[PDB]
Amino acid sequence: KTAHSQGIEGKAMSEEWARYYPRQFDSWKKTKESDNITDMLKEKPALVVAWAGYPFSKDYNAPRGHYYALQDNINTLRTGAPVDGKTGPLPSACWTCKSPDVPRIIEQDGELEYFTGKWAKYGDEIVNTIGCYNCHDDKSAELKSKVPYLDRGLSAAGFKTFAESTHQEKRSLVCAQCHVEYYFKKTEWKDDKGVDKTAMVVTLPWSKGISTEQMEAYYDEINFADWTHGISKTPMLKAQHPDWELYKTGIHGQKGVSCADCHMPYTQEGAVKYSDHKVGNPLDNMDKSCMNCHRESEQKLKDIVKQKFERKEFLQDIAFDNIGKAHLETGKAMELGATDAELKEIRTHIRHAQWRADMAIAGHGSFFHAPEEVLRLLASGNEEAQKARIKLVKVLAKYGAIDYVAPDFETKEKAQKLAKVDMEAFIAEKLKFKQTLEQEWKKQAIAKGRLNPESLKGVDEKSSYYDKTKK
Amino acid sequence: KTAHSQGIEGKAMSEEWARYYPRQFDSWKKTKESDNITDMLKEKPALVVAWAGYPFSKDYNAPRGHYYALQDNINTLRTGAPVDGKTGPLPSACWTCKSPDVPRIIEQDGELEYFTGKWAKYGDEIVNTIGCYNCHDDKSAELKSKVPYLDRGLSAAGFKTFAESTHQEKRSLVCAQCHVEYYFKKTEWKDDKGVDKTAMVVTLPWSKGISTEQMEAYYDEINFADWTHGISKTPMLKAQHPDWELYKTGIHGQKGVSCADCHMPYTQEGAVKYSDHKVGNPLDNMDKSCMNCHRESEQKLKDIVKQKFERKEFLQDIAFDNIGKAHLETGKAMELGATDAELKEIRTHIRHAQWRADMAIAGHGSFFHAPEEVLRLLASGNEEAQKARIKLVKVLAKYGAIDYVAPDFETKEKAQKLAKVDMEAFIAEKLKFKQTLEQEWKKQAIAKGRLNPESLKGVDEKSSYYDKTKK
Ligand code: HEC
Ligand code: HEC
Ligand code: HEC
Ligand code: HEC
Ligand code: HEC
Ligand code: HEC
Ligand code: HEC
Ligand code: HEC
Ligand code: HEC
Ligand code: HEC
Ligand SMILES: [Ca+2]
Ligand SMILES: [Ca+2]
Ligand SMILES: [Y+2]
Ligand SMILES: [Y+2]
Ligand SMILES: [Y+2]
Ligand SMILES: [Y+2]
Ligand SMILES: [Y+2]
């Protein structure tokens, strides 16, 4: 048994686990070191056009350390500027994979209640970032999935549940609680008090399997759409970090190598085995992350990964360039009077093209985890985009614009203009939120004992729209 | 030293090496077991359209055992029906990678002379198939490259020559004498007798590197074309089994695993090491070919290779379908009166699209040797094809045929009709050649002592146009 077999008071706060596991706590906190903010819309402006009419066209950055998950959830322009617990663009489900306070609240008020309401609803309750309680039982310290939607998805896919899985599998599944693709399923229900409520439940689109094509069929079957494209008015599907799903198609995943083997490698100290909890880039610690199974120079292994990235980049830019043009050309055809009937097939091609290409790039490590599937998907996506563009030429020709040239979107600025994203306004509004409601959230949480100020050190120095500079 | 340190009389005939190496001779002869003829034009009729106006649109089969190399060179419709040593469609260079008699003749008459004249020129001299002398020195038995064009290509690419390479590298380079992409360079020269002659020299397009893109730049720089497309009149480039070049981009090649490690695995017998000379499919002998480095079930490893093949197939069919349509649509535009000036850009896209896609599939093992490069190349090729088709729509529209639908070519029969290939005639003509001139070639060779009848056992029972049935 552990030294805390009856549970841990204040378990949601990882600092509460330090007295029992100083080592794991210490390395866990070091994800603070990965504080770089890479503005993906600036790096890949084509993404702005792809996501026109959706929050991702406003703000989308690459992932950084777990230490910043909660704060980035707050800082992203995607969550907007609520004025209270009933305002704001997004729902409560946006907290789900950002805090150990999530299972705390789900365990206290129930799944449906948690998934009911605005994101702003839990502003002063969900204040801790990715912590011990998100992956560990506070009595036995064993690995555990704290979110019901995962087992729900695993079952539907014909997979064993978390409890039924092997230890090695659990070393990847704890990650799968968050590092997976999902959608919000509008769900009606009634509380014990009789009140009728509507919940937005996190659901893994795995009922037909975990391949991109199976998920596609899944979404088409229920005629689902995450949003109607702001430019082409196409029923779009958004892919979100399907890290685990893609990893499963890769050679490492097929061989049984877990996420932890590379991202949380062991360190033996005579009888005692320690897992590095500083979840980050394995390439920074190759001796422990790779050389334990590979017998090759670190530079060569690094060069190989670099090659894979270049390959992915090559196909990514091609696919999203044609996808972008397709959206714009469809928008042009619409302007000339083309009917929905004339654009139906084209829009279906665009929907599938982007779903496949987004699934390929949404998982930032997929280019390495499953290179072959990433390349094939980008190629498949590009083909659907081009099929749409060949048909678009004919629609444009019918309306006298066969020589139309879709505008360029090589910079985030130009792309956001086409996507009609008023950045200055969103940023101004966001800052007001942060300077008022956010600080009130933090002050109240600290007063109630839900948040420890120590955890806020250097947590809010950067975002895509501001950089106070240092550490 | 060996037991034949002064050389071997009749070295071109592998049977002459049997007295010294019965083991290697025995397994070497067993490639006779791989006698399957897979008609690739029947399997992938899109290839017929791609190669319209070129010999490959007539006959193209997958590779089988080395035991059949020489005979298949004779049977393929590509070599046609010579009536003497000065007739026939192809040059003498077509023997180059099919017989140990090649180095014998090159060593006797010189490189230029060998590469001068018709294929039919050496009909009764080049009669032995891939043999010991193609890869071994007849005095020391050491591995050796017998063709000057290889070192020539290696140097141009910044690689070390064969003699400068390591032993492990030689285990792959002996294969590179033939398993590489090449072109015939028209070369003028004068013999010691003063006569002016024209030679067609085998040349490796490696002066800018061995990547598909570098070879492309190489061919474009000299405005080279293997043929003018019979349908689109595009200056085409033909890729031929770039097995070694692609293998070099793969993980095995980068790690130093040679062709021999998988295709000619060792067998230890107490102090004595034997190389299995039955060059074939490693998957038939996985315990010796793969399990020597991998610790996984054979079925799983097989399933993985199968996955890679399906991935390649997926992208291959897409690329060649769009390439086929592009050719046909260009042909249609031509019929309507489109000018070469209006079709120049389109034709450049088609040339590059097919060069890249052909380079990806011409090496039948590339899907496994270098999966990532194969997928990327097929994707790149497809994109160039689609860029051509988008432009083609506009050219067709200008000429009043925007709704033109390129004819289907889902069967070899339909494809060969579009490619205007009169098969019945070519086959009839070929049979007459085989029944007359070919038999005379074999009778004369046997009479002169250049050919041993034993080597002809079951060598000519199959082709793409006839199957006497058994072994
Ligand atoms: C509601 C729609 C959500 C909002 C708003 C955010 N998320 Fe997530 N999220 C999750 C993971 C595993 C990552 C990291 C890997 C990756 O991003 O590719 C993220 C990351 C973010 C970030 C930082 C990156 C960015 O700028 O986009 C933000 C700002 C963010 N998320 C906001 C996981 C999950 C998840 C688990 C299943 C859900 C339901 C959500 N995220 C929902 C939202
Ligand atoms: C002159 C233009 C040539 C003719 C006619 C043939 N070849 Fe070749 N060839 C070589 C290899 C390594 C292979 C095997 C791998 C593969 O085919 O992908 C081949 C195979 C053939 C075959 C059998 C397959 C088929 O039906 O196409 C035939 C009929 C054939 N070749 C005819 C190697 C070389 C090579 C070495 C550099 C040269 C110069 C040529 N082949 C030339 C011709
Ligand atoms: C949900 C509660 C999560 C769990 C469980 C795990 N991760 Fe995570 N991860 C999550 C978020 C929201 C983020 C984004 C953080 C941000 O503010 O940008 C991440 C990020 C990562 C990263 C990126 C690290 C970096 O760039 O420095 C990696 C490599 C990563 N996560 C890996 C990972 C692994 C292997 C996990 C299981 C052991 C794991 N995460 C769990 C959310 C969640
Ligand atoms: C999920 C994303 C995790 C978070 C957040 C934390 N831990 Fe963890 N821990 C995780 C894995 C996958 C593993 C390895 C499991 C295995 O048996 O292989 C661990 C392991 C531990 C252990 C056991 C000893 C060790 O391997 O180091 C302990 C005691 C432990 N973790 C503690 C711990 C604490 C205190 C955390 C918060 C500060 C914490 N973990 C977070 C995954 C995750
Ligand atoms: C052991 C548990 C492993 C760890 C940790 C890492 N790798 Fe690995 N890798 C391993 C296996 C068993 C295999 C499958 C092939 C086999 O030998 O059975 C691989 C394969 C690769 C590959 C080749 C496939 C490819 O995508 O090109 C590469 C390039 C590779 N591994 C790199 C790599 C790196 C950089 C790692 C650290 C981040 C890493 N591997 C860890 C086993 C294990
Ligand atoms: C070793 C073989 C790995 C396994 C198993 C998993 N990951 Fe990984 N991951 C690995 C590498 C080499 C990289 C690329 C590093 C680079 O910067 O080039 C990644 C990357 C990720 C990322 C992207 C992080 C970022 O860009 O900020 C994430 C979020 C990530 N990996 C998650 C993750 C998960 C959840 C895994 C299991 C399903 C997983 N990785 C396995 C190496 C390895
Ligand atoms: C030229 C003289 C060659 C040398 C040297 C090597 N190969 Fe070859 N190979 C060559 C030809 C002309 C053919 C086609 C034979 C036919 O009649 O179809 C082949 C075929 C192969 C195959 C296919 C085997 C099968 O399908 O059963 C393989 C796997 C192959 N060759 C491999 C290979 C290797 C690894 C070599 C070096 C050790 C090698 N070949 C040398 C011509 C020549
Ligand atoms: C090229 C395509 C080859 C042909 C045709 C033949 N041999 Fe070969 N042989 C080849 C390789 C790549 C190797 C391995 C080299 C190494 O040292 O790793 C060999 C090896 C031999 C040997 C050495 C002992 C052994 O490894 O078995 C002998 C004695 C030998 N080869 C003989 C031989 C004979 C008699 C052949 C014709 C019947 C023959 N080889 C053809 C490549 C090739
Ligand atoms: C030893 C000399 C090898 C032989 C013989 C074969 N493989 Fe291999 N393989 C080997 C290494 C060193 C690596 C690189 C990764 C590493 O562990 O360092 C690999 C990798 C693979 C892979 C993974 C990459 C991929 O394309 O998915 C696979 C699937 C694989 N090897 C399969 C395989 C098969 C089927 C073999 C026999 C025909 C084979 N390998 C032989 C080393 C060696
Ligand atoms: C092991 C890791 C290999 C190395 C190294 C090389 N080859 Fe290979 N080759 C290997 C496999 C698993 C396969 C596919 C088998 C299947 O049928 O699925 C191949 C295939 C080829 C082929 C195609 C043969 C045919 O389709 O008839 C050829 C001609 C071939 N390989 C040649 C070859 C050469 C010359 C290599 C070195 C440059 C080489 N292979 C390396 C496995 C391995
Ligand atoms: Ca989604
Ligand atoms: Ca060529
Ligand atoms: Y405590
Ligand atoms: Y990162
Ligand atoms: Y691979
Ligand atoms: Y003799
Ligand atoms: Y074969």
Curated annotation (Swiss-Prot), chains A, B:
Its cofactor is Ca(2+); heme c. Substrate binds at Y182, H241. Heme c 5 binds at H252, C290, C293, H294. PROSITE patterns: MULTIHEME_CYTC. Heme c 4 binds at C259, C262, H263, H369. This is Cytochrome c-552. Heme c 1 binds at C94, C97, K98. Homodimer. Interacts with NrfH. May form a heterotetramer with NrfH. Disulfide bonds: none annotated. Catalyzes the reduction of nitrite to ammonia, consuming six electrons in the process. Has very low activity toward hydroxylamine, and even lower activity toward sulfite. Sulfite reductase activity is maximal at neutral pH. It is found in: Periplasm. Its EC number is 1.7.2.2. SUPFAM superfamilies: Multiheme cytochromes. It comes from Wolinella succinogenes (strain ATCC 29543 / DSM 1740 / CCUG 13145 / JCM 31913 / LMG 7466 / NCTC 11488 / FDC 602W). One of its GO terms (cellular component) is outer membrane-bounded periplasmic space.
